[PDB]
Structure formats: C-alpha cells, structure tokens
Write a protein that binds this ligand. Structure first.
Ligand SMILES: [Ca+2]
Ligand SMILES: [Ca+2]
Ligand SMILES: [Ca+2]
Ligand SMILES: [Ca+2]
Ligand SMILES: [Ca+2]
Ligand SMILES: [Ca+2]
Ligand SMILES: [Ca+2]
Lengths: 319, 319
C-alpha cells in the first residue's frame, strides 16, 4: 500500500569507514571498481553525501573529482549520477535538457509529467536556487506550441485534490476529451490541457474509463507513440502517469533498451532518480507489461562494471 | 530498511460490496471458491473484520459459520485462520498448543522465541482477556525442566534495549556460552538462560560472533536440530531469531514441507501470522538459504484451492 524503491539506508552506517574503503579502492595506480560499485549502490543517497563529506575531512580530497578521473564511460556516468544529491537531480536534468534549439524534449516530458505536485514545487525552488532563473521561463524560452503551454500548466502544480467523485463531471470531461481527440488534438487546446493538467488523478482515471465506454477504444490509441509530435507525446505521458507513474516509467525503461542501441542516458536517469521512490513498483509493472524482467533486459543490453552496478540498483531479478 | 509482509490494505475498499461478493459466492447449493480465496487473500485482516461485520448487517448471517460449512479440509483451515483477528491469533495458537501431556511444544517455542517484547506483552494481555488464565501459569502447568524456565524468562519480555556496545561484556558472555555448550547445556542453566533471554539483540549478535573466534564453530552446531530435547530446540530457535527472525521463520517453513508429508498446521500458521509483518523478508531468506523459492515449495507440495490461496498469500515467485 506504499511506493518503494530498491535502495535503503545501510544499517550500521559509518561514514568514516566507508570513506576509507573508497579511498583504499582508488589510492595508487590501480582501481577496485567492484568495491566502489558495491558500496555506493548499497548506501542511500543521503549516506553518499555524508561519505563525500567524511572523504574531504579525512583525506583533503574531493570524492567526486577522484571518481571522475578514476572511472570512465557509462560506469563513470552512472556513479556520478548516483552521487548527485537527490534534491538536485531533477532540476539538474531539466536544466541540462533545456538546450535552446537542441532541447531534449523527452527529458522535459518525462520529469514534468511523472512528478507529483509536491515534487514539482521542490524542483522549481531548487532550480531557481541553482541557476538563477525560473524553470518556467527557461521552458517557455526553449519550447513552442501548446507543448509549451501544457508543460507550463503542469509546472503550476495546481492539480485538484483527490476528493469526492462527480459522475456528472466525469461524463462531460470524457465527452470533451473524445472530441478533442476526434480533432486530432489540434483544436481547443487550452480546454483539454485544463482537463489533463488540473483535474484530480482519481477523477481522470474515471474520465479515462468513461472514454472507453463512449468511444470503444482507450484514449492512448488516439496518439501514435512513435510518430506523434511533442504535445501528443506529452499527453501520452500524462495519461500513462495518471494511470500509474511506475507503469509509465517502466515503459520508459523498456523503450530505452528495446531495439538497436541503448538509450543509456534514460536508463541511468530513471534507475537513479527512482531508486529510493518507486523502482520496486517500476520493476513489477515492467515484468507484467513486457513479459520479461528489468533485470534480464539490463543484463542483455549492458556490459562491464556499468552492468553490475545497474543490476545491483535493480536489486533482484523478477519472476 | 523496514520489515514488510505480502498483504496490504485493498485500495478503494468497500466492505458492503465485498460482503455481497462473498454471499454471492456461497448462496445456493454451489460454491465459488475462487472468488472467496481471491478476495480474502487480497484484503487485509482488518478489512476482513469489517467484511464480516457488514456481512452480518446485510444478511443476518455469520460469515465465519458460512465459510466453515461451505469449505472443507486444509482450504477451510487456511481461510478460517486468515479470518481470525490478528490481535488474537498468537494467543489462540498458544492456548491451542497448551495441551497438558499432549502439549505442542513446537508452537510454544516458535511463537515465544520469534516474537518481539512488544508483541509478547500484547499476547499476554490478550491471552488473559480471552481465557481467564495468565499465559505463564498455563505454560508452567504444561511444561517442565529448564525448557519451562527459558520460556518463562522470554515471556517476561524484559530484554535489554539496543544500546551501546560493551566489548568487555561481549568477551565474558561468549566465554560463558562456550562453557555451557561444552557441558551440553545441562549445567548452570539459569546463567545461559539469562544471557539468551535478557541481553539485547545487537549484543547477542556480537556474542555469537565472538563465540566463533573463541570456539572455531558457530553456536548452533552445539545443538543437533533433529534429536535435541525441548530446551535445546528452544535455544536454537532463540539463537536463530536473534540473528534474523525472517530467517528463523523461513527455516521453519522449509522443514514444514521438507521430506515425506507436509506440516500443514505450521505452513498455515507461519504464512498467516507473518502475512502483514515480514512474509516478504521470510521469502527472501528462504530463497538464499535453501536455493529454491517458497512459491515453488508450496506449489510442489500442496493442492487445490488450498494451494492457490497459499500462493496468493506468498504473493510472488522469487528468483
Ligand atoms: Ca504532492
Ligand atoms: Ca515566469
Ligand atoms: Ca490532492
Ligand atoms: Ca451454502
Ligand atoms: Ca510495540
Ligand atoms: Ca544439546
Ligand atoms: Ca498475482
């Protein structure tokens, strides 16, 4: 009855002993990648921050700097991602995505659609603290269309509270959504944006069910997952996140490794950002919806120290 | 970093609708065992109590009475066990085991060794409320030897709190335990009983480790698990519960189905009593220590509606 990650506080945690273990793993010309990945994936993010502090006090060096030069490639990127303070991770990912003409719209859609209003408020505050500009201003300056508008409405974090059901409002909203979809989501955008972005989660779940009975198909089938534009991809992410945030992020992981190549940025981002929130539930939705475990997918697509750290973050194989 | 069972509160729970579902499953000459086991194993124990209350209000019948006549065999016993209020289950199991000359010492040892001081205090209060006789008097009246004495000390629920380590006391207690074991646990029983029963869990874990270095073998190997008397079986249960309560109860499940025949009473008791506390960690310990999942063991040894309900209580297969 609760969300659950795969990483928890290590019992009997001694930040000074862990700092010594990590320094022993890199002092000298050699490296003990196994010791580094085993310790860091078994300590919580808060514990990693205390290790980094004890590391600086004991040895007068910077742990993150040492890891960046001692490690390489995707393994380095994963370890560096795990060391980023949890409170800063999403704000950092969004700022990195906001790239003017080269903006990574997948990251904007992923984070803004799947984070709760509480999380988005914290992100907006942290974002201004770290970068001196508002997240909304950066998004507006770097996106266009009603994709921009829907992101702005979601960033407002003003979603209705899970209150009593209103079947009269569940009929009219579902009627409106059926009709915006009939017009290919290119008409009256502000109205379906207000429905997708401000109605309560429990309400929209009933609206999506009422959409089934009115239309004969689920609302997701009005949007092609591969060829649609940015707004449509955001609507799909919002719909799936309304149904289940773990299921949306599980599908995000699935398509990160499906087919030729691997989207390692998305793989690292989802496993790290959700490791202490709902990665266990993501694993369950993954096994149910794609007939194979997240563990087996990671094992088949990745290699080296990078793979073992990802498998330890995944925690277990699912059957 | 938390214990976790396999059964949680059903979301959107409606006790009147569930009562109607259960009545629909037994009204008439037929029975829908699938509907009964699917609903009852997916509702928490507290929710089952509200279903039974709504059942009596809606229909003027007793749900437990209806289940007892509609179901048979081990399936009936499992469903009846799940319906017993959680607050009463251990006290009922102990009273049922306290049978004078036919006393079931395995149940006494299992519950009293693996329950926390907090749980034991609740059990003692409930036991008096339901049966009019303190739990200690019945235990003393139906047990003998220093097995009786060690149970009484454990029932006192006065174990030292997890405080700061004392390596000097960890040397002396382990010396004393090594020496009681050298005398086959038949000398100065009150002295190792005080150590096993009143020292803190974290202290005894260090004592058990210090016992390794002093003796060269773990303390469990001074007791044959199959031929040992009642006191020795209790010492083994206490030692294993000090190391890990989930691991002790996992081993209890393993030997409940190992070999010829099935100890269905123990199987039902552990799965039900630990369904909303630590059955998930029991499943984990089971897979590591016995190279096979609890799911696979239940599947291979049980049958019918009884098996299905046990597998749903188990939750998932472990891999
Ligand atoms: Ca919130
Ligand atoms: Ca602004
Ligand atoms: Ca709310
Ligand atoms: Ca009947
Ligand atoms: Ca308590
Ligand atoms: Ca013995
Ligand atoms: Ca299932």
């Amino acid at each position: 009855q609760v969300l659950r990650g795969t990483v928890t506080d290590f019992p009997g945690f001694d930040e000074r002993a862990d700092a010594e273990t990590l320094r022993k793993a890199m002092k000298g010309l050699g490296t003990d990648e196994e010791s580094i990945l085993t310790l860091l994936t078994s300590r919580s993010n808060a514990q990693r921050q205390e290790i980094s502090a004890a590391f600086k006090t004991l040895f007068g060096r910077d742990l993150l700097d040492d890891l960046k030069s001692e490690l390489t490639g995707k393994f380095e990127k994963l370890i560096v991602a795990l060391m980023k303070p949890s409170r800063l991770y999403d704000a950092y990912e969004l700022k990195h995505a906001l790239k003017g003409a080269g903006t990574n719209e997948k990251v904007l859609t992923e984070i803004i659609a799947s984070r709760t209003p509480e999380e988005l408020r914290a992100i907006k505050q942290v974002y201004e603290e770290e970068y001196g500009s508002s997240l909304e201003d950066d998004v507006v300056g770097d996106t266009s269309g009603y994709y921009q508008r829907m992101l702005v409405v979601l960033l407002q974090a003003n979603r209705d509270p899970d209150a009593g059901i209103d079947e009269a409002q569940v009929e009219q909203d579902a009627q409106a959504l059926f009709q915006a979809g009939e017009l290919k989501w290119g008409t009256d955008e502000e109205k379906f944006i207000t429905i997708f972005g401000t109605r309560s989660v429990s309400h929209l779940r009933k609206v999506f069910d009422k959409y089934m009975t009115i239309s004969g198909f689920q609302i997701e089938e009005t949007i092609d997952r591969e060829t649609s534009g940015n707004l449509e991809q955001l609507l799909l992410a919002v719909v799936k996140s309304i149904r289940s945030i773990p299921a949306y992020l599980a599908e995000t992981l699935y398509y990160a490794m499906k087919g030729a190549g691997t989207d390692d940025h998305t793989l690292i981002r989802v496993m790290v950002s959700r490791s202490e929130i709902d990665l266990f539930n993501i694993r369950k939705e993954f096994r149910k919806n794609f007939a194979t475990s997240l563990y087996s997918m990671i094992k088949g697509d990745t290699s080296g120290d990078y793979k073992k750290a990802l498998l330890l973050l995944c925690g277990e194989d699912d059957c």
